[PDB]
Amino acid sequence: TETTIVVHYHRYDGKYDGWNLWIWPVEPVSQEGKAYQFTGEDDFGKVAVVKLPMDLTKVGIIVRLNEWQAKDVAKDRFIEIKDGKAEVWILQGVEEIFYEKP
Amino acid sequence: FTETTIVVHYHRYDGKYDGWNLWIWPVEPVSQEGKAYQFTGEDDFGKVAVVKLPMDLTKVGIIVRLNEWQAKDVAKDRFIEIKDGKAEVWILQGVEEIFYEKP
Ligand SMILES: OC[C@H]1O[C@H](O[C@H]2[C@H](O)[C@@H](O)[C@@H](O[C@H]3[C@H](O)[C@@H](O)[C@@H](O[C@H]4[C@H](O)[C@@H](O)[C@@H](O)O[C@@H]4CO)O[C@@H]3CO)O[C@@H]2CO)[C@H](O)[C@@H](O)[C@@H]1O
Numbered sequence: 001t002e003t004t005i006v007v008h009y010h011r012y013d014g015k016y017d018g019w020n021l022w023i024w025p026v027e028p029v030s031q032e033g034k035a036y037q038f039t040g041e042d043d044f045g046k047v048a049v050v051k052l053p054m055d056l057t058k059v060g061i062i063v064r065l066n067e068w069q070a071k072d073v074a075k076d077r078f079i080e081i082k083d084g085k086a087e088v089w090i091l092q093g094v095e096e097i098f099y100e101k102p
Numbered sequence: 103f104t105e106t107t108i109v110v111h112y113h114r115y116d117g118k119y120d121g122w123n124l125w126i127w128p129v130e131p132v133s134q135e136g137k138a139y140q141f142t143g144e145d146d147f148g149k150v151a152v153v154k155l156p157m158d159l160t161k162v163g164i165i166v167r168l169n170e171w172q173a174k175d176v177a178k179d180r181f182i183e184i185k186d187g188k189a190e191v192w193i194l195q196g197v198e199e200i201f202y203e204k205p
């Protein structure tokens with residue numbers, strides 16, 4: 001009844017203040033998104049544990065600065081989800097979203 | 103012409119740059135055994151090497167290695183495609199894709 005997405009984010013400039021995640025359901029339903037904040041950190045960068053109150057197989061994600069001051073990769077990207085859980089790694093300026101730790 | 107210059111930018115998310123260097127070998131138009139090249143500089147993205155080879159090359163191989171082959175950062179051979187004897191690339195720890203503009 002929920003989808004949990006752990007998002008790892010690394011910026012080579014070390015300047016994470018204000019960066020947050022705009023995530024929206026896409027399948028099996030499309031709905032307007034919400035902003036999610038980073039909740040922790042590890043050796044790769046910031047960590048967000050995102051909980052969405054539906055079972056989802058795909059979401060959209062944009063890494064954004066404050067309220068749309070900038071987009072780190074300014075196009076919609078997607079995360080494929082199995083059994084209500086995914087974990088991804090995202091790097092500043094790199095379009096590809098990784099499903100294993102670099 | 104008669105030399106090839108490759109500027110190689112390297113970023114590690116863990117900051118553990120100590121010992122890392124570049125193994126580069128000519129591949130086209132003629133293949134030869136490689137050589138190690140050290141980083142000489144640094145910028146906001148991380149380490150920088152300027153690699154000069156005394157031939158006009160359209161393709162080189164590259165491996166990012168720790169000292170004398172103690173480890174590789176991405177273990178498979180990778181290649182850089184070069185036009186008119188000059189190229190510049192950006193390499194990220196653990197990321198296979200070599201980038202041709204700054205992330
Ligand atoms: O089912 C809901 C909708 O879902 C999908 O919409 C996505 C977009 O595709 C994403 O790009 C994003 O939209 C962001 C947008 O990227 C961002 O620039 C900002 O856009 C605002 C803008 O700041 C504002 O000034 C105003 O002019 O409107 C803009 C909207 O374009 O904020 C957007 C979020 O509000 O996320 C949405 C989902 O939230 C889907 O593709 C749509 O078909 C669908 O309606």
Ligand SMILES: OC[C@H]1O[C@H](O[C@H]2[C@H](O)[C@@H](O)[C@@H](O[C@H]3[C@H](O)[C@@H](O)[C@@H](O[C@H]4[C@H](O)[C@@H](O)[C@@H](O)O[C@@H]4CO)O[C@@H]3CO)O[C@@H]2CO)[C@H](O)[C@@H](O)[C@@H]1O
Nearest residue numbers: 125126127128133134135136137163165170171172178179
């Ligand atoms: O002359 C053209 C040759 O070019 C190509 O050879 C390449 C390889 O494909 C690359 O992988 C690399 O080789 C490295 C190798 O990756 C690395 O592991 C290391 O291997 C050592 C090892 O540490 C050591 O313990 C012992 O086993 O010796 C090994 C080498 O036999 O070092 C290699 C380089 O010395 O670079 C070369 C070019 O230098 C092409 O594939 C060949 O067919 C071609 O002959």
